Write a protein that binds this DNA or RNA. Structure first.
Lengths: 81, 150, 113, 18, 129
RNA sequence: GUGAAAUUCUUGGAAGACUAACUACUGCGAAAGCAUUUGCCAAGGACGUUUUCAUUAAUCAAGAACGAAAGUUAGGGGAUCGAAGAUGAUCAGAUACCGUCGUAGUCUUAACCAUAAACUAUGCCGACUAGGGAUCGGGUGGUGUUUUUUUAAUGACCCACUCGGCACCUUACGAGAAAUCAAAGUCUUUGGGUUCUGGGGGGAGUAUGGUCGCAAGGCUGAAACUUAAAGGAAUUG
């Protein structure tokens, strides 16, 4: 402290912050690819949803609305991105 | 912080540094343009279109892939409504709280909140009347609003 | 009475429920309830209050059990239910998945018909 | 006879002044 | 609201030089501030510095070496008219030998002695010593 | 019945109120303000957000709303306290503090009044500047735990962090007449933006005129004369 760098902040410490108060901001929310194996056609789903994104063809569910990250509804297998 | 209330809270989106790709992403512009046109035929507000193409479909942002945003598309494809969405929701909340006062004379706190809503109506409608996206002579009053908004 | 005063500790929440209910014959009784949120130990924070929509649903589940046990099989048999606190441990069972409780009682016995 | 407090107490606002 | 920016820039810089600091990060980073910093660096009153580029305004990180007494802003921009530099440098400089009252002319932002040498005038920004 | 006597007492289910304890250096509300259960209504804040919009902003003279109690008006309610008034003493005098009876009022439906120590006695917005632990709401991570049923899940709690609060505690670089103050700091090295108010004390918030109100009142608001003080902050008998 009292002589240091903000051109190179350390990684986990700069990840410790709130998203807005980082050095150059870029968010943390994620896209991924949910499979309920009844349909082998993958659904790219955001970290949060607000809305019950169901399966593609068979109308059941894939997620519930949360206060935080969206809840993958337990018939699930996924790559992230 | 908070034009008509006391908080100072920060809560928002944050557009990434990218003015190009995702490059996990492969699709074309026209596909999600068609999807916007489809959901406009269903009749949703552009916030709800952005929400639904966020979570359900893989779209990151409209403006990265398609250089006209969602309301530019609805205006450009002849499906823009009379009043923009936020002013509409303000008048909708206004006629809601007004009706709530029309059956409840007793709550003055609701009347205070109603007058704050009306102040936001006048400020925001004045911004819209400024840049001519309302007609100059656009008029707000509850007598007209009861048939106007809904 | 002094039992109820010994029940009352600070920093915690009181939960009372009440319901009016007829038995099989023409005998009507308003029964009460007392239940305190207990500290679910391994606590660090000192108080263990409830969350005030918790208290709604706890009062409702207590009043639900109070409605389910009474108006079936008159206050003789209902008192036979009330003796081994089948009711209070049922309150414990139904409430414990949210926030457990302590001092679960119906606290009174009185008729009005 | 503990009340669920009501029925304003005698003595006035400034109380029993002595 | 955030009514002026160079104000808050100089405020951050003075509060850092007070508390012994070596670097700052200021925001939201206008061109005028870059001009001001280049003016100070021309005399050396700060060290060097660096723009960073978010897609909103950028931010700045400045090295501040050892020699900032006070860097202040005059507000509002008063219309200096050449004979008034004697007024303002009489008021807000520690002596007749150093410090610079920097001012914004049609010929750009520069200190007062460059406005003596290039013989223009205009409005005033502030003062560095 | 009290400090004591005494006026005072000795064969003589309804009503109205309010939500104790739990009640916290805790939450909410623009304040003034708010604690039973349940319902519904319309909101509101914070958090999340790769949703939308693109200066729509800040402060606000004029101008309106809101606004504790008490007072005013038309009903009702009228269970309790209780300005006034009446005793019965005490004290030299005591018209009272003390008791007894106690009308209006108090409570409420429909309107004035718009007042308070409405006090944090500290305008509103914007940044920057120091350590510490607690605590509220929310969210994220965890080979944390609990719970058992079969692992989970949940729900609680633990832990590392992050915002948004009400707070605290120590400091002091700084500020100040000092008390004290994370703002009352970033002010003679005096300029981020902006509404209001003050210019010795008395006379006197009186006179005067205007103004709202039925009125009470409020709002607005001097001079003649007079005087050298009036006022804010520490120690030893």
């Amino acid at each position: 402290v009292l002589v240091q760098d903000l051109l190179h902040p350390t990684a986990a410490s700069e990840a410790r912050k709130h998203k807005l108060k980082t050095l150059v901001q870029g968010p943390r929310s994620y896209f991924l690819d949910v499979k309920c194996p009844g349909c082998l056609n993958i659904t790219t789903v955001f970290s949060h949803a607000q809305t019950a994104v169901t399966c593609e063809s068979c109308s059941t569910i894939l997620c519930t609305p949360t206060g935080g990250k969206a809840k993958l509804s337990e018939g699930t297998s996924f790559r992230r991105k | 912080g908070r034009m008509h209330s006391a908080g100072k809270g920060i809560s928002s989106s944050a557009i990434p540094y990218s003015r190009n790709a995702p490059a996990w992403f492969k699709l074309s512009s026209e596909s999600v343009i068609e999807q916007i046109v489809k959901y406009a035929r269903k009749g949703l507000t552009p916030s709800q279109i952005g929400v639904l193409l966020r979570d359900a479909h893989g779209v990151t942002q409209a403006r990265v892939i398609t250089g006209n945003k969602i309301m530019r598309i609805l205006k450009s494809n002849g499906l823009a409504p009379e009043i923009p969405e936020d002013l509409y929701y303000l008048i909708k909340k206004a006629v809601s709280v007004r009706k709530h006062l029309e059956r409840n004379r007793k709550d003055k706190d609701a009347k205070f909140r109603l007058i704050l809503i009306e102040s936001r109506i006048h400020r925001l409608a004045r911004y819209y009347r400024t840049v001519a996206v309302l007609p100059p002579n656009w008029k707000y009053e509850s007598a007209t609003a009861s048939a106007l908004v809904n | 009475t002094d039992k109820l005063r010994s029940m009352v500790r600070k920093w915690q929440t009181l939960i009372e429920a009440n319901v009016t209910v007829k038995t099989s014959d023409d005998y009507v009784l308003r029964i009460f309830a007392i239940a305190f949120t207990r500290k679910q130990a391994n606590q660090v924070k000192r108080h263990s209050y409830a969350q005030s929509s918790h208290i709604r649903a706890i009062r409702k589940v207590i009043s639900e059990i109070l409605t389910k046990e009474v108006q079936g099989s008159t206050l003789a048999q209902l008192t036979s239910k009330l003796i081994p606190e089948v009711i209070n441990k049922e309150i414990e069972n139904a409430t414990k998945d949210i926030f457990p409780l302590q001092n679960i009682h119906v606290r009174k016995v009185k008729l009005l018909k | 006879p503990v009340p669920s407090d009501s029925t304003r107490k005698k003595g006035g606002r400034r109380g029993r002044r002595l | 609201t955030r009514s002026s920016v160079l104000a808050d820039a100089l405020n951050a810089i003075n509060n850092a030089e007070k508390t012994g600091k070596r670097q700052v990060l200021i925001r939201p980073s206008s061109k005028v501030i870059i001009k001001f910093l280049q003016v100070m660096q021309k005399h050396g009153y700060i060290g060097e510095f660096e723009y960073i580029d978010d897609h909103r305004s950028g931010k700045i990180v400045v090295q501040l070496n050892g020699r900032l007494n006070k860097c202040g802003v005059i507000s509002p921009r008063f219309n200096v008219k050449i004979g008034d530099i004697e007024k303002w440098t009489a008021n807000l400089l520690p002596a007749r030998q150093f410090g610079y009252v920097i001012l914004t002319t049609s010929a750009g932002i520069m200190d007062h002695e460059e406005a003596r040498r290039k013989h223009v005038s205009g409005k005033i920004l502030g003062f560095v010593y």
